Task: inverse folding
């Protein structure tokens, strides 16, 4: 969630942040 948001943020930009955050 926390790390997923940061990692997804760098990969899927803003959209990635949301998905990473909700990415259980």
Result:
């Amino acid at each position: 969630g926390l790390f997923g948001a940061i990692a997804a943020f760098i990969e899927g930009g803003w959209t990635g942040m949301i998905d990473g955050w909700y990415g259980s």
In short: The first helix runs from residue 2 to 11.
